[PDB]
Subunit: 358 residues, 3 copies
């Protein structure tokens, strides 16, 4: 395309002061800079690269067809939650995998969704704001299937009364979590048939094709380079800031991940198209909940690393109410600003409980 | 009727190879056959007898009237869950009573209901499939009254902190469970007035009358003969198969019980009448939940046998999500196949958690 | 007004035999009467004074305007739950504050609401009974925000496994409860703008003005005089009746408090206006849940008294099901008598569990 949209669209992001963070993460590695600065200049280097992957992926959709063009249009908003989950599972920091994959479900149900209803409720306060229910009820049937897979290994850990030690109940949680994962991958392959082929009918570009595959390695081998620096240097970056590792992982780190889905769900909220702001905010809390999370169990199954679906007692109660307050909000096909301020303030309640949790 | 429908309708079951299991359970008793074979040839002998009672009971409805013909039409699908619960309560195997009466609630909410939506969604994928909400909302108000009676004696067992030993909190669970049962029998007598008399309007035969009372003892004193053999020989039949007694009782045994309600809820799903497949699958999880279960407490109250509504922590969390995922599925009066595959896969999640639970 | 409605309207209460209980509480103080009688003649002295405040407050609404006349019309039904909560927090009986503010949420969701549907369902059984959903969905979004603030300090108390003693986890519950309260007062100030100003349009008197301020001190300094006698003499009045202090506080004491809201929600149920019986029964379980309860934490924050949002395990499970069975009842805008009998019998289940709880 003769180097024209290769310089303008790269400088055509609504956030573009974050591009000099990328040279100040490799150079600061080979100079002996202390580890909080490498952590500060790696989150600010993945924030436009989480968008430039999740925008240029749509540019390859117009060169494939109707089948794959319904798949890659709705599967690569989560190409940063996947790389950080695998470059922390192989580094044996298994707890950070359980928080960043939980904070990407809560941010897509409370902060992303409850800003499309608030900011796109005040601008359109003198119009009627309608979406459809049948298009986004399937996204809540699957999250209640995911919650049952997280509830049951939690309650097995509190069965120490029943004449069993810890070595029995730990290989009982680990056996049923490695069997719930195959059941969770089947209710997402079936979802990717209902959404694409069977019920499609009830449901131009600017860039050349050869550009779209060159950059989507040049914007992926830089996410995989910086996702090591976030994982391998999160401990000293949690002792010089006086923050907990169960707050950086669950609150600050999903903001870098879900920043592509958080300017697409808001711009289509000012345009009064809330069918689209519910496809981005809900259809990406299902890909995390039922394809990205049970795939980590299967990769741990192969590598010999122990990992089960036990998040914890305080993390599961936040997951249970996030699905119930979202379901009762979206059950009549009409919205206003007070539906979205209740979802924001339920996210400032979770964000206090982990700021104190030391 | 001159021995004509007495030989044709008896041979007129869609499952009729299970009739020679009945002679091979009495003869194998008086020959010293080892106890797994008596257990194998007793479940296969109760499967057509759970249907021939729950079909010939409708034949007596056309000889009584409108009042009783709305009662016996909807009260004797559960004439096998009642005999096995009483022929195990008097044999002091109280735990098997708590599993088989729970696995008859889960099978009617997930496996019976989620097959009428899946098998009757693929055949009618090119039509619109509608039921009514007001006819089956009362069935969920009562199950939330039943769940509160099971939640509260569970949480009293975890109040050992409050300066009370086990002998105090065991006669505190036992006192409130014997008072919740009278409150549960009143919200089912009131349901049998709302359904029959007060709101009836908003809601031929082939066999003679004298045939219909002869067989309905000859098909009931054979259920009561074989329900002893299932109860008194479940222990050695759980050591020669390497299965748990909390899997045989909760999964394999309700399949023999709910096999009359599992070919009537499916044939009316191919006929695109989902008002009727929701009256069989939901109106029989309410008779178990609010008439068969609180009647066992009252019979234990009279016989001096200690029994309360405490199922357990792992069994109550499966009961809580089964009511919530069923309520959010049925709240718009329209169905398709993906609503029923989520209910089947939530039953293959419960069936793993108890296959491992040794 | 020349002493005419000052004698007729004071004698114009539908309960007026309870007025001689007021002289028999001050005289019995200065005569050495034993403390159960002062407790018996103080609940019967606050029952017409909980009504005469919550009726004459509407008489001052017609002398202020549209703004304040939407506020005092809906903020002083709870002028007795507030005085008893503060005259027990300063007397260091902190547990009674946690029960009487819980039994005012349960009575407004089950006993007040489930009598407007039952008594106003039998009188209007031959008509169709409709309310609106959008007017009373906001009242359930806020109660799910209140429940998350009560769920999370409960689960922190069961984190004694995580290498922390009791002195760590008690100043961890106390820190997050004093930060959840500011988040709860903001989602009620925002509710008092949505209800009054922004969405008003989608949503004579008999007494002079100068009468309305004289009596509303003369009916408030008698509530504050008798609310000391209920608090300071509840212990011996729970040893001469053989009742628990977690039954008098949660069942018998809210009946005196919610007796103004329990003849206004019933008379508008016989008149077939269920938009109004849902504004009294639901809009007063939100003022308790999100303005009266988080204000007690802030007053305890200033006075140096330790108080957090931890009610208990058995009290939170009763709060969780009370919101779920109320939400599934009111989701179609139509009512009948069987919706209200299920809500009454769920209140006779809570009232047994605390009658035994000694
Ligand atoms: Ca993302
Ligand atoms: Ca049955
Ligand atoms: Ca009140």
């Amino acid at each position: 395309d003769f180097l024209s949209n290769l310089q303008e669209v790269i400088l055509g992001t609504k956030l573009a002061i974050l591009f000099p963070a990328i040279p100040a993460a490799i150079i600061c590695t080979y100079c002996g800079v202390s580890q909080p600065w490498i952590f500060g200049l790696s989150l600010l280097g993945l924030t436009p690269l989480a968008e430039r992957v999740s925008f240029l992926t749509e540019q390859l959709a117009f060169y494939t067809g109707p089948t794959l063009g319904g798949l890659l249009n709705a599967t690569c908003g989560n190409a940063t939650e996947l790389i950080i989950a695998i470059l922390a599972l192989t580094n044996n920091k298994v707890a950070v995998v359980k928080y960043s994959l939980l904070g990407s479900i809560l941010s897509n149900l409370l902060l992303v969704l409850g800003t499309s209803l608030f900011c796109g409720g005040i601008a359109n306060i003198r119009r009627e704001q309608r979406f459809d229910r049948k298009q986004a009820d399937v996204n809540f049937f699957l999250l209640l299937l995911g919650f049952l897979c997280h509830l049951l290994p939690l309650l097995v850990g509190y069965l120490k009364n029943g004449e069993a030690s810890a070595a029995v109940l730990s290989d009982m949680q680990l056996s049923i979590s490695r069997g719930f994962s195959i059941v969770m991958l089947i209710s997402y392959i079936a979802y990717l048939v209902f959404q694409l082929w069977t019920h499609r009918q009830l449901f131009t570009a600017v860039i050349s094709f050869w550009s779209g595959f060159a950059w989507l390695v040049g914007m992926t081998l830089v996410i995989a380079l910086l996702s090591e620096y976030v994982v391998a240097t999160i401990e000293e970056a949690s002792d010089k800031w006086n923050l907990s590792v169960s707050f950086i992982s669950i609150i600050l780190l999903p903001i870098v991940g879900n920043a592509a889905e958080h300017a697409g769900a808001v711009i289509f909220a000012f345009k009064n198209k809330l069918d689209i702001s519910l496809g981005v905010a809900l259809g990406s809390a299902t890909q995390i909940g039922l394809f990205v999370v049970p795939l980590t169990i299967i990769v741990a199954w192969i590598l010999g690393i122990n990992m089960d679906l036990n998040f914890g007692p305080l993390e599961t109660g936040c997951l249970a109410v996030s699905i119930i307050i979202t379901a009762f909000t979206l059950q009549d096909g009409s919205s206003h600003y007070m539906k979205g301020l209740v979802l924001l303030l339920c996210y400032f309640i979770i964000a206090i409980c982990f700021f104190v949790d030391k």
